[PDB]
């Protein structure tokens, strides 16, 4: 039937609303992108409505689409299977020697546009560290570990990584859970890995604070790192 991956057989779009704060400084972001079939290599553009973003955009990368990873046959694409009802995410990213980002996401489908609403609290960030001083340069590739969790959720663990301006790295520990919002039975995956390659750049057009980002994301059974 017309559920789950059947709703991902065409080109699609996505839209993201983020309500956040960092060290008590409120910010608001909106973002829009597309994912062309067969998925796995998708782009987004994001803008801060509140003015200048008060922290690096790099740690926002994972807030601005698991359902647009490319999955092989043989591994359940849980995130796609969650549609049309959608899914919620609860996620904590803990930056080494720095602060912690805790987010709650909801995802719904409208026609071919997956819309997410996200709240995020970014607490304990170091004022002289490379997040608050905007010193993160590149986003490293990550191999995340996905595993089923209970009857209707999948968890993942990873380390997320950023290079810094003077040749160092900033790593965070990433824990996230996706929960199906419906009640019908959907296929839970076996444990597996997803390779995530991210490239974020500043958009220097005009005056406003905006970025472009691309993500290549693909699943596989055995780790490559």
Author numbering: 1 to 64, 68 to 228
What's the paper's own text on this?
To further expand the toolkit of available phototoxic proteins we have very recently come up with a blue-shifted KillerRed variant carrying tryptophan-based chromophore (substitutions: Gly3Cys, Tyr66Trp, Asp113Ser, Asn145Ser, Phe177Leu, Tyr221His, Glu236Gln) named KillerOrange. We also constructed monomeric mKillerOrange by introduction of the single Tyr66Trp substitution in SuperNova, a monomeric variant of KillerRed.
The crystal asymmetric unit of KillerOrange contains two dimers and one monomer forming a dimer with the symmetry related subunit, while the crystal asymmetric unit of mKillerOrange contains one monomer. Similar to parental SuperNova, destabilization of central hydrophobic patch in the dimeric KillerOrange by Leu160Thr and Phe162Thr replacements ensures a monomeric state of mKillerOrange. In the channel of mKillerOrange, we found a glycerol molecule, presumably coming from the cryoprotecting solution and replacing three out of seven water molecules present in KillerOrange. It is described by the χ1/χ2 torsion angles of 175°/16° and -178°/26°, respectively (rotation around Cα-Cβ and Cβ-Cγ bonds defined by dihedral angles N-Cα-Cβ- Cγ and Cα-Cβ-Cγ-Cδ). In both structures, the indole ring of Trp66 in a dominant trans-cis conformation is stabilized by hydrogen bond between the indole nitrogen and the side chain of Gln159 and shows a noticeable deviation from the chromophore planarity (χ2 ~16–26°). Conversely, in the minor cis-cis conformation the indole ring is nearly coplanar with the chromophore imidazolinone ring and is stabilized by a hydrogen bond with Thr201. Similar to their red progenitors, KillerOrange and mKillerOrange, show the presence of a water-filled channel extending along the β-barrel axis.
